[PDB]
Amino acid sequence: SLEAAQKSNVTSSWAKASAAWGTAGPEFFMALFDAHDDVFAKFSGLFSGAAKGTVKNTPEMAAQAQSFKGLVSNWVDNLDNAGALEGQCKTFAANHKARGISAGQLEAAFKVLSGFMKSYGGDEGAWTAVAGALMGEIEPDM
Numbered sequence: 001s002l003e004a005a006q007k008s009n010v011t012s013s014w015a016k017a018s019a020a021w022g023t024a025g026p027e028f029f030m031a032l033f034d035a036h037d038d039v040f041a042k043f044s045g046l047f048s049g050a051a052k053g054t055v056k057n058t059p060e061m062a063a064q065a066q067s068f069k070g071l072v073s074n075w076v077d078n079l080d081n082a083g084a085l086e087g088q089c090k091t092f093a094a095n096h097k098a099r100g101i102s103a104g105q106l107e108a109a110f111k112v113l114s115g116f117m118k119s120y121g122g123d124e125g126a127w128t129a130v131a132g133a134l135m136g137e138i139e140p141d142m
């Protein structure tokens with residue numbers, strides 16, 4: 001399910017993306033929005049009706065990339081701690097469900113992120129495994 005090597009690659013590659021997140025965060029969001037238009041739709045409120053092509057350098061974009069980074073960092077720091085993962089996962093799921101976001105959409109986001117992490121030395125198979133363990137804690141609450 002999740003080997004020691006897989007955890008190690010996830011933690012290391014995350015430390016590298018994290019040091020670059022000021023520029024990489026918005027690029028990840030754009031990759032996601034281009035791949036899934038239905039995902040972009042859920043942010044219409046935050047972006048005030050603006051077209052997708054115009055959002056990358058907005059102050060809203062910047063805040064949203066910082067939000068994303070703070071939860072991902074928490075999860076990566078607790079890979080050997082199922083109890084801690086479950087708690088964060090529950091809050092996360094409750095807040096997103098309340099917005100009418102589906103388990104399928106969350107899953108799409110983890111897929112885009114696993115591909116994106118190849119740039120920071122991430123093993124896509126290690127990122128996919130981590131996503132499968134997290135989704136197993138989230139799905140039951142969606």
Ligand code: HEM
Nearest residue numbers: 039042043046067068071072095096099101105106109110
């Ligand atoms: C790996 C998957 C995801 C991560 C880490 C993530 C993380 C977060 C966090 C930490 C927040 C701010 C805390 C909160 O109010 O909930 C958040 C906000 C939000 N997320 Fe996500 N999320 C992801 C997936 C999504 C997905 C796929 C969508 C869209 C379909 C999305 C839509 C939103 C929106 C609409 C907000 C509220 C934005 C605002 O007005 O401040 N999130 N997400």
Ligand SMILES: [S]
Nearest residue numbers: 064065067068
């Ligand atoms: S998000």
